[PDB]
């Protein structure tokens, strides 16, 4: 787009090439997909040419990737002080049709494995990585994950080497792979996650900075999915979260389940909603938040 | 006022009231007027007759008619009970239960209440409780405080012997205790529209009324069960949360009651009821009035 009377840094040649590139593809292939990674805040990368966009269908949410990763290397003791980096991502989550992206670029050149990036001991590293993926799947936008991130590989990605598949013998790595498997199953089945527009996202609570917890909602039409995230290894008991609908609520996924390698703290399936106001909501669920865990909950149907 | 209006008399009444308060600024004049003549209690300078008080004879008729009715049937006459409050602030009123109601075959207040003796005593204790809660001052003719059987017979003395028997001694205790509540709490001193707020009035099936009587800080909550059936898990909305006390229960055994009660220590639950932030989960005694205030 850029090159570094006219004095213009924008390479206008290329911008028309990109625009005529994208136009031509969809004309000859109406069902193709074009994705761009653009690390500037160039507007409307994912926008149609007739609105002066670059004409891509998808743009990498590299802002999200940076913010999320920078937030999760910090130690939970310090996460109190960087709460805004987690919450602020949504502000820019809708300017483009976006793919949340974790890629080779971030797991090379001394930047360290995704697992390596996460702080604390081995259980906490697995917990942190399980949470990162949990919030990543809950966060609006499509999903991309590079090889080896799915089991939480220790080593940086080396092209001269094959992934450390031997790590699949260790339980935590197998649990991370199962967590991702289970995440994709929920993703494929619950349409509340299909719509990454402002439609599909509602905040439940973002103001718990001391305990570093965030609650948000994902909703297409009638269906809704509740996300409660504990970003600290300290378990939370009798934590109330406001909800729109009353009645029995189901626990659809628990990051801390033993099947994923977790402590196993959870809410045992059914939680009953209390017709008492919380977070500006008519009802609320009083839940137990496991250490460094993401909880996905559904009203019962 | 009439004979159509008699203006001779109307100017006379207006000058009577004008003169009294001039020579005796702290006197009280009360009027009984059996038509819907406006501004009896209003000052002459506003085209009123200049009285300080009016007997609420409308209230008395509606109230007595409602309680003459059986609780089984009170369902179909709920509006007679609830609608007294549309006309309750038209004048400065005194709720009235005079001698004129206990003569000429109209029957003692006791005789008027339906059912067996317990229900008769219960009904009268309930009636007075509601009358003390309803906006307006209170007037009770002698012998009503025991709920005496016989009509007022001036040629004899009241049946004080009934004060030995339980049901009538209980009603005398109830009136005394109601009078204690009245003087102690200012929430009942202000018979203004501001003083009264509805809690619930649409329970026609179960024949229950919940209302609030207010002055500033103070609130008094009145819950009334007009059927001989105890009600359990009956929730009543309230403005304030926290501990609530049971100040009075008509059904206390000391009054001749069954004794079903909340007996104080009632904690508000923050669940919306009756369009209110917090709710009380109570037991409604038979044909009884509960009076509750927030604990302080």
What secondary structure does DSSP assign to B69-80, as a single string? S-HHHHGGGHHH
Measure B165 CA to nearest chain A CA, in Å: 49
Which residues touch B83 (CB under 8 Å, ≥6 apart)? B62
Q: B interface mutation test: which of A275, A278, A281 has the most B CBs within 10 A?
A: A275
- How many Å apart are CA A208 and CA A249, to the nearest integer? 22
The residue count of chain A comes to 301
**Would you state the structure tokens that stand for residue A160, as one six-digit string?**
């001269």
Q: Select from B101, B136, B108 the least CA-distant residue to B123.
A: B108
- ∠ CA(B218), CA(B221), CA(B223), 5° rounding? 170
- ∠ CA(B11), CA(B16), CA(B22), 5° rounding? 125
On whether the CB atoms of residues A46 and A196 are closer than 8 A, the answer is: no
- How many Å apart are CA A82 and CA A96, to the nearest integer? 25
**Would you state the structure tokens that stand for residue B227, as one six-digit string?**
């059927």
Backbone phi, then psi, for A69, in 5-degree steps? -65, -45
A2 beta partners: A10
B267 beta partners: B243
Which residues touch B292 (CB under 8 Å, ≥6 apart)? B220, B221, B223, B244, B245, B246, B247, B262, B266, B280, B282
Q: B140-164 burial by CB neighbour count: b if 16+ within 10 A, else e?
A: bbebbbbbbeebbeeeeeeeeebee
DSSP symbol at A157: P
On whether the CB atoms of residues A185 and A252 are closer than 8 A, the answer is: no
Closest alpha carbon within chain B to A283: B271
Task: Give the max Cα distance, chain B.
Answer: 61
**Would you state the structure tokens that stand for residue A21, as one six-digit string?**
């590139």
Do the strands A223-230 and A293-299 form a parallel or antiparallel pair, or are they unpaired?
antiparallel
Between helix B117-133 and helix B57-68 the angle, nearest 10°, is 150
- How many Å apart are CA A254 and CA A267, to the nearest integer? 9
10 Å CB burial of residue B126 (0-12, 13-18, 19+) is: buried
Backbone phi, then psi, for A201, in 5-degree steps? -125, 130
Elucidation technique = X-ray
Do the strands B53-55 and B208-215 form a parallel or antiparallel pair, or are they unpaired?
unpaired
CA atoms within 13 A on the CB side of B143: 23
- ∠ CA(B180), CA(B235), CA(B120), 5° rounding? 50
Which residues touch B218 (CB under 8 Å, ≥6 apart)? B185, B186, B187, B293
Measure A244 CA to nearest chain B CA, in Å: 15
- Which residues of chain A are within 8 Å of residue B272 when distances are taken between CB atoms? 275, 277
- How many Å apart are CA A33 and CA A57, to the nearest integer? 6
Determine the distance from the C-alpha atom of residue B268 to the mean position of all C-alpha atoms in its chain, rounded to a whole number: 26
Backbone phi, then psi, for B271, in 5-degree steps? -125, 130
Chain A positions touching chain B (beta carbons under 8 Å): 275-277
- Which residues of chain B are within 8 Å of residue A278 when distances are taken between CB atoms? none
On whether the CB atoms of residues B272 and B228 are closer than 8 A, the answer is: no
**Would you state the structure tokens that stand for residue B193, as one six-digit string?**
């529209």
**Would you state the structure tokens that stand for residue A208, as one six-digit string?**
């718990």
- How many Å apart are CA B228 and CA B222, to the nearest integer? 17
- Which residues of chain A are within 8 Å of residue B271 when distances are taken between CB atoms? 275-276
Task: Give the max Cα distance, chain A.
Answer: 70
A241 beta partners: A285
B279 beta partners: B237, B269
How many CB atoms lie under 10 A from the CB of residue A262? 23
Closest alpha carbon within chain B to A274: B271
- How many Å apart are CA A96 and CA A133, to the nearest integer? 21
Task: Give the resolution to one decimal, in Å.
Answer: 2.9
On whether the CB atoms of residues A36 and A97 are closer than 8 A, the answer is: no
The 3-state DSSP class for residue A272 equals strand
Closest alpha carbon within chain A to B270: A276
Closest alpha carbon within chain A to B278: A276
| Residue given tokens 């009651």 in the structure block | B257
Measure B195 CA to nearest chain A CA, in Å: 29
10 Å CB burial of residue A214 (0-12, 13-18, 19+) is: buried
Which residues touch B107 (CB under 8 Å, ≥6 apart)? B151
- How many Å apart are CA B227 and CA B285, to the nearest integer? 9
What strand order describes the sheet that includes B53-55?
B30-31, B53-55, B93-97, B137-140
Q: B48-77 burial by CB neighbour count: b if 16+ within 10 A, else e?
A: bbbbbbbbbbbbbebbbebbebebeebeeb
- Which residues of chain A are within 8 Å of residue B268 when distances are taken between CB atoms? none
The residue count of chain B comes to 296
Closest alpha carbon within chain A to B279: A276
The 3-state DSSP class for residue A199 equals helix
Measure A278 CA to nearest chain B CA, in Å: 11
Give the CA radius of gyration of chain A.
21
- How many Å apart are CA A104 and CA A196, to the nearest integer? 24
| Three-state SS annotation for A18-74 | HHHHHHHHHHHCCCCCCEECCCCCCCCCCCCHHHCCCCCCEEECHHHHHHHHHHHHC
Q: A interface mutation test: which of B235, B241, B267, B270 has the most A CBs within 10 A?
A: B270
Measure B203 CA to nearest chain A CA, in Å: 22
Catalytic center residues of A: 37
- How many Å apart are CA A70 and CA A85, to the nearest integer? 8
Measure B189 CA to nearest chain A CA, in Å: 35
* Dihedral class, residue B271 (left if φ above 0, else alpha if ψ from -120 to 50, else beta): beta
How many CB atoms lie under 10 A from the CB of residue B274? 16
- Which residues of chain B are within 8 Å of residue A275 when distances are taken between CB atoms? 271-272
On whether the CB atoms of residues B11 and B49 are closer than 8 A, the answer is: no
Q: Select from A179, A169, A183, A104 the least CA-distant residue to A139.
A: A183
Q: A interface mutation test: which of B271, B276, B278 has the most A CBs within 10 A?
A: B271
- How many Å apart are CA B13 and CA B211, to the nearest integer? 37
- How many Å apart are CA B34 and CA B56, to the nearest integer? 9
On whether the CB atoms of residues A64 and A93 are closer than 8 A, the answer is: yes
Determine the distance from the C-alpha atom of residue B258 to the mean position of all C-alpha atoms in its chain, rounded to a whole number: 22
Q: Tell which residues of chain A come right before a gap with C–N over 2.5 A.
A: 4
- How many Å apart are CA A249 and CA A271, to the nearest integer? 5
Q: Select from A233, A245, A250 the least CA-distant residue to A289.
A: A233
- ∠ CA(A211), CA(A93), CA(A83), 5° rounding? 20
Determine the distance from the C-alpha atom of residue A275 to the mean position of all C-alpha atoms in its chain, rounded to a whole number: 31
- How many Å apart are CA A243 and CA A282, to the nearest integer? 7
Helix (H) or strand (E) holding A174: helix A171-189
- How many Å apart are CA B93 and CA B275, to the nearest integer? 30
Which residues touch B102 (CB under 8 Å, ≥6 apart)? B108, B109, B141, B143, B144, B151, B152
Q: Which one is catalytic: B26, B32, B145, B159? A: B32
Chain B positions touching chain A (beta carbons under 8 Å): 270-272
- Which residues of chain B are within 8 Å of residue A242 when distances are taken between CB atoms? none
How many CB atoms lie under 10 A from the CB of residue B182? 16
Helix (H) or strand (E) holding B293: strand B289-294
Q: A interface mutation test: which of B235, B237, B272 has the most A CBs within 10 A?
A: B272
- Which residues of chain B are within 8 Å of residue A277 when distances are taken between CB atoms? 270, 272
Which residues touch A176 (CB under 8 Å, ≥6 apart)? A126, A129, A130, A133, A150, A151, A152, A260, A261
Q: Select from B218, B212, B210, B211 the least CA-distant residue to B185.
A: B218
Give the CA radius of gyration of chain B.
20
Distance in angstroms between the alpha carbons of the first and the last residue of chain B = 50
CA atoms within 13 A on the CB side of A152: 30
How many CB atoms lie under 10 A from the CB of residue A114? 27
**Would you state the structure tokens that stand for residue A180, as one six-digit string?**
């991702």
Judge whether B32 counts as a catalytic residue: yes
| Three-state SS annotation for chain B | CCCCCCHHHHHHHHHHHHHHHHHCCCCCCEECCCCCCCCCCCCHHHCCCCCCEEECHHHHHHHHHHHHCCHHHHHHHHHHHHHHHHCCCCCCEEEEECHHHHCCCCCCHHHHCCCCHHHHHHHHHHHHHHHHHCCCEEEECCCCCCCCCCCCCCCCCCCHHHHHCHHHHHHHHHHHHHHHHHHHCHHHCCCCCCCEEEEECCCCCCCEEEEEEEECCEEEEEEEECCCCCEEEEEEEECCCCEEEEEEECCCHHHCCCCCCCCCCEECECCCECCECEEEEEEECCCCEEEEEECC
| Residue given tokens 């309803």 in the structure block | B134
Q: Select from A138, A128, A54, A129 the least CA-distant residue to A93.
A: A138
**Would you state the structure tokens that stand for residue A265, as one six-digit string?**
């703290």
Q: Select from A92, A106, A287, A286 the least CA-distant residue to A198.
A: A92
Which residues touch B21 (CB under 8 Å, ≥6 apart)? B27, B50
Which residues touch B105 (CB under 8 Å, ≥6 apart)? B151
On whether the CB atoms of residues B67 and B80 are closer than 8 A, the answer is: no
| Residue given tokens 């005394």 in the structure block | B176
Determine the distance from the C-alpha atom of residue B291 to the mean position of all C-alpha atoms in its chain, rounded to a whole number: 12
- Which residues of chain A are within 8 Å of residue B270 when distances are taken between CB atoms? 276-277
Size of interface A-B (CB pairs under 8 A): 6
10 Å CB burial of residue A86 (0-12, 13-18, 19+) is: buried
Helix (H) or strand (E) holding A139: none
Closest alpha carbon within chain B to A276: B271
- How many Å apart are CA B11 and CA B42, to the nearest integer? 14
């Amino acid at each position: 787009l850029y090159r570094d009377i006219f004095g213009g840094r924008e390479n206008l040649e290329a911008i028309d090439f990109i625009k005529k590139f994208n136009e031509t593809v969809y004309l000859h292939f109406p069902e193709a997909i074009t994705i761009a990674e653009e690390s500037t805040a160039w507007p409307g990368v994912s926008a149609p040419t007739y609105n002066n966009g670059l004409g891509f269908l998808y743009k990498w949410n590299m802002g999200w990737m940076h913010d999320t990763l920078d937030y999760m290397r910090r130690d939970p003791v310090h996460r109190k002080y960087h709460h805004d980096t987690l919450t602020f991502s949504l502000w820019y989550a809708f300017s483009e049709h976006y793919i949340l992206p974790l890629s080779h670029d971030e797991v090379v050149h001394g930047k360290g494995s995704l697992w390596t990036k996460m702080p604390g001991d081995d259980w906490q590293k697995a917990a942190n990585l399980r949470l990162l993926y949990g919030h990543m799947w809950g966060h609006p936008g499509k999903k991309l994950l590079f090889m080896g991130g799915e089991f939480g590989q220790h080593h940086e990605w080396n092209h001269d080497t094959q992934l450390e598949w031997h790590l699949l013998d260790q339980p935590y790595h197998r649990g991370i792979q199962a967590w991702v498997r289970d995440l994709n199953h929920l993703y494929r089945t619950h349409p509340a996650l299909w719509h990454d527009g402002p439609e599909g996202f509602e905040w439940i609570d973002f103001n718990d900075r001391d305990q570093s917890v965030i609650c948000y909602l994902r909703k297409h039409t009638d269906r809704l999915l509740l996300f409660v995230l504990n970003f600290t290894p300290v378990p939370r008991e009798h934590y109330r979260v406001g909800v729109p609908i009353g009645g029995p609520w189901r626990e659809v996924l628990n990051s801390d389940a033993v099947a994923y390698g977790g402590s196993g703290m959870g809410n045992f399936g059914r939680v009953e909603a209390v017709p008492e106001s919380w977070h500006g909501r008519p009802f609320h669920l009083e839940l137990t938040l496991p250490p460094l865990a993401i909880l996905i909950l559904e009203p019962e149907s």
